[PDB]
Design a protein around this nucleic acid. Structure first.
Length: 48
DNA sequence: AAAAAAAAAAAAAAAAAAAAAAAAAAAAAAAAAAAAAAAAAAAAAAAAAAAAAAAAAAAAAAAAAAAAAAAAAAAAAAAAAAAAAAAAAAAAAAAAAAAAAAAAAAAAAAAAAAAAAA
């Protein structure tokens, strides 16, 4: 589950992951996302 | 686009380490008595020096313990086999100076934003 929320005032968007798959570690997922951002694999991640 | 290797799921096998608390011993590093050793003073037994002397090597010569000869017999030591102790020769090594790659601070300047003036 992953929506794309947009604030009323500013146009900047955010992705909110409500749920994750089965037998997936949340900490390892976040570490993988951070590694992808540091290695410039994924483009457009402002924060995490 | 093919090959190869990591990693993660869950039941299995098998291990490892840090501290507290008291009382005794064992290493290991220091002050501090205590005695060799060394520098620099005065001080005092020994060599010198000389005259004077008498105790032991020479010399005669007998004789009595001796070192070579003979014999028998016992068996220490030497050289050849093996089997251990203990030391130079040579090579290896762990920290350790040298080099190279990544993290944090820096401001110049502008995009976007927030806020307010007339």
């Amino acid at each position: 589950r992953a929506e794309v929320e947009v604030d009323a005032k500013t146009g900047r968007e955010t992705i909110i992951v409500h749920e994750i798959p089965y037998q997936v570690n949340k900490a390892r997922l976040i570490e993988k996302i951070a590694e992808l951002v540091k290695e410039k694999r994924v483009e457009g991640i402002s924060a995490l």
